[PDB]
Enzyme design. Structure first.
Site, PDB file in Angstrom:
ATOM      1  N   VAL A 222       0.804  -1.218   0.000  1.00 22.46           N
ATOM      2  CA  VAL A 222       0.000   0.000   0.000  1.00 22.46           C
ATOM      3  C   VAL A 222       0.850   1.288   0.000  1.00 22.46           C
ATOM      4  O   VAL A 222       0.669   2.174   0.835  1.00 22.46           O
ATOM      5  CB  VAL A 222      -1.038  -0.048   1.169  1.00 22.46           C
ATOM      6  CG1 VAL A 222      -0.380   0.171   2.544  1.00 22.46           C
ATOM      7  CG2 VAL A 222      -2.172   0.922   0.921  1.00 22.46           C
ATOM      8  N   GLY A 223       1.767   1.385  -0.960  1.00 23.91           N
ATOM      9  CA  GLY A 223       2.531   2.619  -1.186  1.00 23.91           C
ATOM     10  C   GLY A 223       3.988   2.547  -0.764  1.00 23.91           C
ATOM     11  O   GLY A 223       4.316   2.781   0.398  1.00 23.91           O
ATOM     12  N   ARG A 224       4.863   2.242  -1.721  1.00 27.14           N
ATOM     13  CA  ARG A 224       6.307   2.165  -1.466  1.00 27.14           C
ATOM     14  C   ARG A 224       6.882   3.512  -1.031  1.00 27.14           C
ATOM     15  O   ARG A 224       6.644   4.536  -1.672  1.00 27.14           O
ATOM     16  CB  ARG A 224       7.054   1.656  -2.706  1.00 27.14           C
ATOM     17  CG  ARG A 224       7.023   0.148  -2.854  1.00 27.14           C
ATOM     18  CD  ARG A 224       7.748  -0.317  -4.101  1.00 27.14           C
ATOM     19  NE  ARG A 224       6.928  -0.178  -5.304  1.00 27.14           N
ATOM     20  CZ  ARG A 224       5.952  -1.012  -5.669  1.00 27.14           C
ATOM     21  NH1 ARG A 224       5.638  -2.069  -4.922  1.00 27.14           N
ATOM     22  NH2 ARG A 224       5.277  -0.785  -6.792  1.00 27.14           N
ATOM     23  N   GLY A 225       7.645   3.498   0.062  1.00 23.06           N
ATOM     24  CA  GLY A 225       8.245   4.713   0.609  1.00 23.06           C
ATOM     25  C   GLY A 225       9.477   5.168  -0.149  1.00 23.06           C
ATOM     26  O   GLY A 225       9.700   4.761  -1.291  1.00 23.06           O
TER      27      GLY A 225
ATOM     28  N   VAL B 204       6.009  -0.251   2.003  1.00 22.75           N
ATOM     29  CA  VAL B 204       4.983  -0.192   3.052  1.00 22.75           C
ATOM     30  C   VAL B 204       3.779  -1.062   2.693  1.00 22.75           C
ATOM     31  O   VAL B 204       3.353  -1.088   1.539  1.00 22.75           O
ATOM     32  CB  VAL B 204       4.497   1.259   3.285  1.00 22.75           C
ATOM     33  CG1 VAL B 204       3.675   1.357   4.566  1.00 22.75           C
ATOM     34  CG2 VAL B 204       5.679   2.222   3.345  1.00 22.75           C
TER      35      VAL B 204
ATOM     36  N   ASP C 198      12.258  15.594   2.219  1.00 21.68           N
ATOM     37  CA  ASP C 198      11.449  14.875   1.240  1.00 21.68           C
ATOM     38  C   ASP C 198       9.974  15.259   1.360  1.00 21.68           C
ATOM     39  O   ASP C 198       9.097  14.409   1.205  1.00 21.68           O
ATOM     40  CB  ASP C 198      11.623  13.368   1.484  1.00 21.68           C
ATOM     41  CG  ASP C 198      11.537  12.545   0.213  1.00 21.68           C
ATOM     42  OD1 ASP C 198      12.485  12.608  -0.593  1.00 21.68           O
ATOM     43  OD2 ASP C 198      10.544  11.808   0.037  1.00 21.68           O
TER      44      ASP C 198
HETATM   45  N1  1UH Z   1       1.214   4.180   7.714  1.00 21.77           N
HETATM   46  C1  1UH Z   1       0.424   4.128   6.548  1.00 21.77           C
HETATM   47  N2  1UH Z   1      -0.900   3.724   6.582  1.00 21.77           N
HETATM   48  C2  1UH Z   1      -1.673   3.673   5.425  1.00 21.77           C
HETATM   49  C3  1UH Z   1      -1.147   4.031   4.177  1.00 21.77           C
HETATM   50  C4  1UH Z   1      -2.038   3.962   2.976  1.00 21.77           C
HETATM   51  C5  1UH Z   1      -1.863   4.457   1.701  1.00 21.77           C
HETATM   52  N3  1UH Z   1      -2.950   4.157   0.957  1.00 21.77           N
HETATM   53  N4  1UH Z   1      -3.762   3.525   1.685  1.00 21.77           N
HETATM   54  C6  1UH Z   1      -5.079   2.999   1.280  1.00 21.77           C
HETATM   55  C7  1UH Z   1      -6.187   3.931   1.804  1.00 21.77           C
HETATM   56  C8  1UH Z   1      -7.580   3.363   1.500  1.00 21.77           C
HETATM   57  N5  1UH Z   1      -7.717   3.044   0.068  1.00 21.77           N
HETATM   58  C9  1UH Z   1      -6.621   2.253  -0.538  1.00 21.77           C
HETATM   59  C10 1UH Z   1      -5.236   2.843  -0.232  1.00 21.77           C
HETATM   60  C11 1UH Z   1      -3.275   3.372   2.921  1.00 21.77           C
HETATM   61  C12 1UH Z   1       0.194   4.432   4.184  1.00 21.77           C
HETATM   62  C13 1UH Z   1       1.116   4.853   3.265  1.00 21.77           C
HETATM   63  C14 1UH Z   1       2.297   5.091   3.943  1.00 21.77           C
HETATM   64  C15 1UH Z   1       3.598   5.588   3.429  1.00 21.77           C
HETATM   65  C16 1UH Z   1       3.733   6.033   2.110  1.00 21.77           C
HETATM   66  C17 1UH Z   1       4.958   6.520   1.641  1.00 21.77           C
HETATM   67  C18 1UH Z   1       6.065   6.580   2.487  1.00 21.77           C
HETATM   68  C19 1UH Z   1       5.930   6.152   3.797  1.00 21.77           C
HETATM   69  C20 1UH Z   1       6.904   6.132   4.788  1.00 21.77           C
HETATM   70  C21 1UH Z   1       6.418   5.644   5.978  1.00 21.77           C
HETATM   71  S1  1UH Z   1       4.877   5.255   5.818  1.00 21.77           S
HETATM   72  C22 1UH Z   1       4.713   5.671   4.265  1.00 21.77           C
HETATM   73  O1  1UH Z   1       2.096   4.851   5.124  1.00 21.77           O
HETATM   74  C23 1UH Z   1       0.951   4.476   5.329  1.00 21.77           C
END
Ligand code: 1UH
EC number: 2.7.11.25
Length: 295
Positions: free
Chosen positions: A17-20, A25, A131
């Site tokens: 659910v979303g590469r950092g 991640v 960033d």
């Molecule tokens: N802690 C997190 N909880 C949920 C989501 C998340 C992102 N999208 N979604 C779902 C929401 C509901 N619909 C589908 C996508 C949940 C994300 C994304 C990230 C994240 C992204 C990029 C860099 C870094 C670095 C540390 S955490 C992080 O962290 C997340």
């Protein structure tokens, strides 16, 4: 103080659910909760995780992702699952996007500055984000509460002194924050019209290019926004100054606590003239302001 220990076998891992910035991640579960974890792609990037943990153990602020724990099983971090995904998605993502309001736009930016200011004020030495961009800004509580993650960043948001490998400071995060203010008000990817590879934005921005001016943007917000864009980092306001200013402005932006729940069908008139149109609407702001002042 310091962080909790969580063995990998207690975690129930689900989909990605979303590469950092460097790791990856995923959605997961841990002790009757919804949770998000990040793991190493390769063993070569183990060094960063050790630097990350000592930092994240110190940080504790409502506008920063709450770390729960970690381990060295497959070595990973364990965070709170932000239900609303990234800000980037909300703004530019999937087919059915949520409607939002000026109040939301400013609330998000305010909340982001509160987080960044917490990092700038950190002792014995300040933490600079570097960033800082919507893909790193997450949303919780029905899109109402914004949170930062990933410290330690595409050209569109990078301050020009960062390109030239010069002695940058906390003020680069201010530049980034300026760009985000433009991005949320307009709901436009900054420098999308330039295109090409990253160096073409860097050239453009290094020569003075900034995002277009926004039509009927109140002067107070325009001057704040453009001051953050200052070529000179010393001419940019401190994040603590931005938190003060934004806080004061929120008086004229009520209804920030309303959750996102309305769909949005957006053409978003591409015709970039001299200026661009805001996506949000400032009529209510001008109204309330006029009531306090004269006009
Ligand atoms: N802690 C997190 N909880 C949920 C989501 C998340 C992102 N999208 N979604 C779902 C929401 C509901 N619909 C589908 C996508 C949940 C994300 C994304 C990230 C994240 C992204 C990029 C860099 C870094 C670095 C540390 S955490 C992080 O962290 C997340």
């Amino acid at each position: 103080g310091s962080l909790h220990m969580i063995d990998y076998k207690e975690i129930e891992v689900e989909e990605v659910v979303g590469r950092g910035a460097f790791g990856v991640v995923c959605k997961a579960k841990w002790r009757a909760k919804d949770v998000a974890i990040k793991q190493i792609e390769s063993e070569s990037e183990r060094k960063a995780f050790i630097v990350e943990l000592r930092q994240l153990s110190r940080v504790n602020h409502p506008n920063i992702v709450k770390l729960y724990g970690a381990c060295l099983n497959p070595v990973c971090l364990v965070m709170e699952y932000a239900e609303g995904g990234s800000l980037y998605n909300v703004l530019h993502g999937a087919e059915p996007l949520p409607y939002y309001t000026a109040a939301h736009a400013m609330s998000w930016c305010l909340q982001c500055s509160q987080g960044v200011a917490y990092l700038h004020s950190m002792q014995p030495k300040a933490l600079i984000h570097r960033d800082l961009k919507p893909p790193n800004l997450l949303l919780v509580a029905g899109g109402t509460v914004l949170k930062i993650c990933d410290f330690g960043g595409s050209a569109a948001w990078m301050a020009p002194e960062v390109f030239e490998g010069s002695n940058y400071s906390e003020k680069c995060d201010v530049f980034s924050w300026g760009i985000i203010l433009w991005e949320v008000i307009t709901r436009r990817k900054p420098f999308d019209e330039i295109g090409g590879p990253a160096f073409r934005i860097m050239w453009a921005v290094h020569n003075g290019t900034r995002p277009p001016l926004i039509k009927n943007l109140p002067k107070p917000i325009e001057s704040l926004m453009t001051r953050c864009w200052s070529k000179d980092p010393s001419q940019r306001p401190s994040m603590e100054e931005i938190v003060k200013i934004m806080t004061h402005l929120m008086r004229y932006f009520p209804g920030a606590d309303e959750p996102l729940q309305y769909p949005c069908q957006h053409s978003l008139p591409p015709g970039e003239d001299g200026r661009v149109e805001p996506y949000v609407d400032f009529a209510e702001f001008y109204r309330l302001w006029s009531v306090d002042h004269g006009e």
